[PDB]
Design a protein around this ligand. Sequence first.
Ligand code: HEM
Length: 152
Amino acid sequence: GLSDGEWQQVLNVWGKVEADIAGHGQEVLIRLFTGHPETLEKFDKFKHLKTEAEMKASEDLKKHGTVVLTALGGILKKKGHHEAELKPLAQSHATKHKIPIKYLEFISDAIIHVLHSKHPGDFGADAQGAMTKALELFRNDIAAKYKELGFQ
Ligand code: HEM
């Protein structure tokens, strides 16, 4: 449950991401994969990436980063009214990709890390609070769908 002012902060922060969705998406995934190498194993199409240099050079990783952040941005712009947008992602990530909710926590924190890394001094405490709450809401609603599906 975010207030109007918190959603305003989220969407203000998101404008930073939308200015360079592929660069943000790439760095989010690289942060996830390097911070939590087990997550790489969930991607048949990225498990060949042995080094961060290879990840950085991967155009397909940037492409997927764009897909991920485009989806997330579409969800965030719903300001919590995202049941229709979230449902297929929860279902695909539970049933097809088999992504534990822990990895969604990892990527949530990776987003925060990337925002500070790319916008040092420009991702204020209020913005971090609001973005964190929005990612928690996202993760929590996914978690509810995971529970429905019995997925761990
Ligand atoms: C912000 C969180 C995330 C969003 C918005 C997101 C979004 C997406 C989207 C839109 C797709 C393609 C459509 C689909 O299959 O449903 C996708 C595919 C996938 N996602 Fe995610 N995802 C997220 C987090 C994760 C995490 C944390 C993992 C694994 C650690 C993961 C693993 C995958 C895999 C394995 C695929 C299929 C990739 C392929 O083979 O093309 N996702 N994701």
